[PDB]
């Protein structure tokens, strides 16, 4: 459950991603695939090489979904219902993998937004990503 301060922090911090959405999302995916190679099992037919255009394109989708989540942060299950159906019902992604990607998103944000990534904002972003992860790993239709 996010506090009002959490929502404020997330909107402010994620708001700085902007046109770098694809780049940051792709970097987070690349970090995950490299650091935690078991995650690649979910993408059996992807080109997961360094600099892959396919990973770049997928990074944009992830980042844009996070933008969507921020714009609906008080009502996320209804806003992300399609993504929950994909990840929980169709793909059956083990919940541990969401912790891995969430960590890699935090690392990416820490590496690119040093001024923004204060301890308080770090805490809020972690809670936000945990909340998104819970929605995407739940079946609630």
């Amino acid at each position: 459950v996010l506090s009002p301060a959490d929502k404020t922090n997330v909107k402010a911090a994620w708001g700085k991603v902007g046109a770098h959405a694809g780049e940051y999302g792709a970097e987070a995916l690349e970090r995950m695939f490299l650091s935690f190679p078991t995650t690649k099992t979910y993408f059996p037919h992807f080109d997961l090489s360094h600099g892959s255009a396919q990973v770049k394109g997928h990074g944009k989708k992830v980042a844009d979904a996070l933008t969507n989540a921020v714009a609906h942060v008080d009502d996320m299950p209804n806003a992300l219902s399609a993504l929950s159906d994909l990840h929980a019902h169709k793909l059956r992604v083990d919940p541990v993998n969401f912790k891995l990607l969430s960590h890699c998103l935090l690392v990416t944000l820490a590496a690119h937004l040093p001024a923004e990534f204060t301890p308080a904002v770090h805490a809020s972003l972690d809670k936000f990503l945990a909340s998104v992860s819970t929605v995407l790993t739940s079946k609630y239709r």
Binding site: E27, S35, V107, A110, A111, P114, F117, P119, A120
Partner: protein, 146 residues
Amino acid sequence: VHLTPEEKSAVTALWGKVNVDEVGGEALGRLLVVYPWTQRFFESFGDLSTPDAVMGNPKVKAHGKKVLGAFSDGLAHLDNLKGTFATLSELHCDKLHVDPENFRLLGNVLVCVLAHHFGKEFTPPVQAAYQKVVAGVANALAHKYH
């Protein structure tokens, strides 16, 4: 932990640039702020009521130094983490009863702090090498649970 010579070189080179006096406190402080239940283990440390109080707490900074030193000890002998951390494992597991998921959390907070400090230099391959290190350290700390 099995690092390639290239990975060990990358990890060692970066760690040589890590501020011994500050980075451990930053990581311990962020653990206390991001995962607040961990504050329960640090009652005697004084004021942990706000993120600023935590990050400015002298005992957090001082303790953080010790934590960093233990990671440093791990780095010095990657082929014997279990031996290196045996005493610390007894302390954290048998005496303090820290749930071992929290060992993973602190390792990952350290990785975030390294990324924050080094920016572009903390590349995905450098991260991957550090993730092997912090997983090894967490496993070694948890050894008395296994």
